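Bench log. Compound arrived from synthesis this morning; before running ITC I wanted a structural hypothesis for how calcium ion sits in the protein. Inputs:
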Amino acid sequence: AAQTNAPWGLARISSTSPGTSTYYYDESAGQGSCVYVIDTGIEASHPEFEGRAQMVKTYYYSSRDGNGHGTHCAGTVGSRTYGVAKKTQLFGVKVLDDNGSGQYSTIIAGMDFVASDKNNRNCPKGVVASLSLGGGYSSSVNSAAARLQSSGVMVAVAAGNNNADARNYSPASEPSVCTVGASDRYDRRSSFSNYGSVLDIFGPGTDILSTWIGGSTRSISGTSMATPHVAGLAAYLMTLGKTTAASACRYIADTANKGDLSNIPFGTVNLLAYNNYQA
Ligand SMILES: [Ca+2]
Ligand SMILES: [Ca+2]
């Protein structure tokens, strides 16, 4: 399949080179996989989700996404126009309030929820969790991410937007998950992207068009706009049978575009998520 005039990030993950406009992908499109978006929620009614999104848990008074952040991230995973995995099932877990903030205890609960809840769901191609969030280092938060991974979920987390070593941020610094940095359309490390030895992979994160609340769309930037690219790619590869929840981050790194990025500090991987699609 080919989506012409795709958002640059989708085009980028299906090319060995920057500057293309077409997103090439296998038409299976992550069908039969499930991605939990742990965030501010998902506006499941957005036409772009085609009924494939639903809220499954909230830690606040409502399950509504009153911010937009979670809806944007979910859109990059699996919306029709803006998504990597256009036929995946999306599950919303609202651990962040409508200002985009959340307590560590709640974020941990949300992770533990997904580890259990997946057993109530029909996801024959496997399960992914996308965590576009984080704060300062916490062993408790890291441990929760490690548990979720261990339970058989592909966990992808944002590296953070501090232009610093991700070792001092959680869940970014948990080694056993997939820690995602951000790049821009000219293959530069995004100016804000964290870096460091803990990063597994980079994804498109600067000027990312996706879904927004009120049935709208907008372009925003962050390591968290890169995280769902990798989560969606994982789901896509899992549907294809190329890899598993336990091994997908490694597989993505194995098959990444190598050395294409600039302003990568010594000691940080120079690896850009790539679907290696051959028609
Ligand atoms: Ca290249
Ligand atoms: Ca890792």
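What the model suggests: DSSP finds six helices and 15 strands in the chain. Residues 41 and 63 are 6 Å apart (CA to CA).
ITC booked for Thursday regardless.
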